Amino acid sequence: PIPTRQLFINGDWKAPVLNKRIPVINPATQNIIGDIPAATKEDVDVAVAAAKTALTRNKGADWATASGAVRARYLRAIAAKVTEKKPELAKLESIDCGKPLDEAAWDIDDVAGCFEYYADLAEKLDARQKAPVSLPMDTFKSHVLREPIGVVGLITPWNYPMLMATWKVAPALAAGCAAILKPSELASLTCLELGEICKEVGLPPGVLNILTGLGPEAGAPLATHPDVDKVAFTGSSATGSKIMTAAAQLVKPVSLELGGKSPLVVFEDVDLDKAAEWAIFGCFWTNGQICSATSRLILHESIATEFLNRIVKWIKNIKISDPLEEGCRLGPVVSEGQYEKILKFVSNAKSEGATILTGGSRPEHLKKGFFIEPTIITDVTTNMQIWREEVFGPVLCVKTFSTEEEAIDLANDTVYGLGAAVISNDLERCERVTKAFKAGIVWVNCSQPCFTQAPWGGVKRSGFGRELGEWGLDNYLSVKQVTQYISEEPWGWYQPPAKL
């Protein structure tokens, strides 16, 4: 059932030069279920060269210098193909990364949705070219051209395998770039299947190249390659640093989407079951593996007790099972390494004097797989590890407040600044807290809903630059100023040689 593939390079399948391969593990069962190719520098070198050629081939006429509407057709066709293979792609996603099937299906709709969104942006791009710049002199004219930034390396995480890749691939292709996508080794199946869809769409060879493998072996050489114009990255802050470090040696532009410790602030004037559902979605959905997870509950003390009672009840209704099982609302975490790391976060918080209100370990009824109960940790102190560090599992901590000012202070109490959410019936209070949040994304009376139309990214230690929306496309376009002297007069700055 699980496909066996090569690297996708220059329009076709291709064995890694050193022919190495790595396991595919199903997090729900812990069994090895196949393998994926493991790329090295010599594969990067081939892929990058293929990308270069794809940009220059035929004067760039098939891709780079073609009109946006031409690229748009390719992106619409990729979108229709994804929609066609939805049932299979969603199942491979759930198998590969462990998210509930109903989540994977949502992801696959949004992959198609993203390609279509950027296809429409590609059609609008042609009219955006040669944008006049108004000048305070009639002796010059100036305009702007928007050109493909060039060869791009795209390095993505496993929590939303196909979708994270798409967020980068769609605008990059829409802008006329040629991409090397390096998906997470923990979940590469659906990205490899993106290769097949490229073949079936007839996407020009070298325009998209997919290289699976270990981060240091296959990701790292993208950031140190003379012919890579930009690296776009989503994942850990630590890996971000390393990639940014390496790129510096060649002053290569890098964009970083990183993790966070996002706050959800819940005021007293709310429907408790609505606010309880959003809090669970904010921390436990995607099996807690959300970069922008509201993993810190900032809860008005007047309702603390009854909110926590309600939220625990909701947790008890969450069906935790194999992701493919009907009605699944929580799957296993992606891997053994993470499973053990998450539980260590829970025990450390126990060792520091915090209370496990609910959850804390694997569920009793599941013997195999990396399953963890939705955990709520209470009696939490500002200096505890649980409060400051990203857990990336179904683990929420709770602190209480009374004043709006104290809630904001607790909210902004972190080195990160990706997401933030406020829930209150008082809308002027929502706006006030919105403005006070030091985050790139703020949700009002919800937590987590993510639209392709709107800009996505962090402040402080959560990285920089925005993806999605028009920002997403602009990340892959280089701006060229064209300024023209239209006066027939000599510049007249230097003294001319006398005539005779």
Provide the annotated binding site for NAD(+).
158, 182, 236
Binding residues for Na(+): 25, 96, 186
- The nearer residue to ligand NAD, 157 or 394, going by C-beta atoms, is 157
Q: Does 360 help bind ligand NAD (rule: CB under 6 A)? A: no
Selection from ligand NAD, a second copy, Na ion, none that 454 binds (CB < 5 to 8 A by kind) is a second copy
Give the residue, chosen from 68, 157, 161, 463, that forms a contact with ligand NAD under the rule CB under 6 A.
Answer: 157
Q: Which of 394, 432, 397, 395 minimizes the C-alpha distance to 414?
A: 397
Taking the CA atoms of the chain, what radius of gyration do you get in angstroms?
Answer: 25
Least distance in angstroms from the C-beta of 269 to a second copy? 15
3 state DSSP class of 40? coil
Q: Would you list the DSSP string of 126-177?
A: GGGSSEEE--S-TTEEEEEEEEE--EEEEE--SSSHHHHHHHHHHHHHHTT-
- In whole angstroms, the minimum distance from the beta carbon of 494 to a second copy comes to 5
**Which residue in the set 182, 252, 296, 300 belongs to the binding site for ligand NAD (CB under 6 A)?**
182
**Active site positions, annotated:** 257, 291
Question: Considering the rule CB under 6 A, would residue 216 count as an interface residue with ligand NAD?
Answer: yes
Q: Give the separation between CA 34 and CA 1, rounded to whole angstroms.
A: 10
Nearer Cβ to ligand NAD (154/398): 154
Contact 219, 210 (CB under 8 A): no
**Member of 113, 235, 332, 458 binding ligand NAD (CB under 6 A):** 235
Half-sphere exposure of 489 (CA within 13 A, CB side): 7
Report the C-alpha gap between 245 and 252 in whole angstroms.
10
Q: For ligand NAD, which is the closer residue by CB, 198 or 342?
A: 342
Q: Given the complex with ligand NAD, which of 259 and 323 has the nearer CB atom?
A: 259
Evaluated on CA atoms 61, 66, 70, 74, the torsion sign reads positive
Pick the binder of ligand NAD from 156, 448, 452, 475 (CB under 6 A). 156
Q: Which does 446 bind (CB under 5 to 8 A by kind): ligand NAD, a second copy, Na ion, none?
A: a second copy
Q: Are 336 and 369 in contact (CB under 8 A)?
A: no
Q: Is 295 in the site for ligand NAD (CB under 6 A)?
A: no
Binding partner of residue 33 among Na ion, ligand NAD, a second copy, none, CB under 5 to 8 Å per kind? none
Q: Which residues pair with 36 in a beta bridge?
A: 22
Pick one of Na ion, a second copy, ligand NAD, none as the site partner of residue 96 (Cβ within 5 to 8 A by kind): Na ion
* Closest CB 431 distance from ligand NAD, rounded Å: 34
Q: Does 239 bind ligand NAD (CB under 6 A)?
A: yes
Nearest residue to 1 via CA among 108, 89, 107: 89
Q: Would you say 25 or 207 has its CB closer to Na ion?
A: 25
DSSP 208-277: EEE--S-IIIIIGGGTT-TT--EEEEES-HHHHHHHHHHHHTTT--EEEE-----EEEE-SSS-HHHHHH
Residue 242 as a binder of ligand NAD (CB under 6 A): the answer is yes
Paired tokens of 86: 């939805």
Judge contact between 172 and 152, C-beta under 8 A.
yes
174 neighbors 121 (Cβ within 8 angstroms): yes
Site string for ligand NAD, 185-204 (x = CB under 6 A): x-------------------
CB of 102 to ligand NAD, least distance (A): 23
Of the candidate residues 54, 220, 275, 280, the single one contacting ligand NAD (CB under 6 A): 220
Residue 107, Cα to own-chain centre: how many angstroms? Answer: 12
Known binding residues are 25, 96, 158, 182, 186, 236
Amino acid at 479: V
In the bound complex, what is the minimum distance in angstroms from residue 219's beta carbon to ligand NAD? 3
Contact status: 236 vs ligand NAD (CB under 6 A): yes
- Binding flag, residue 393, ligand NAD (CB under 6 A): no
Q: Give least dist CB 497 to a second copy, A.
A: 4
Sign of CA dihedral 470, 475, 480, 481: positive
Closest-CA residue to 24 (of 235, 232, 193): 193
Contacts with ligand NAD, residue ranges (CB under 6 A): 155-158, 182-185, 215-216, 219-220, 235-236, 239, 242-243
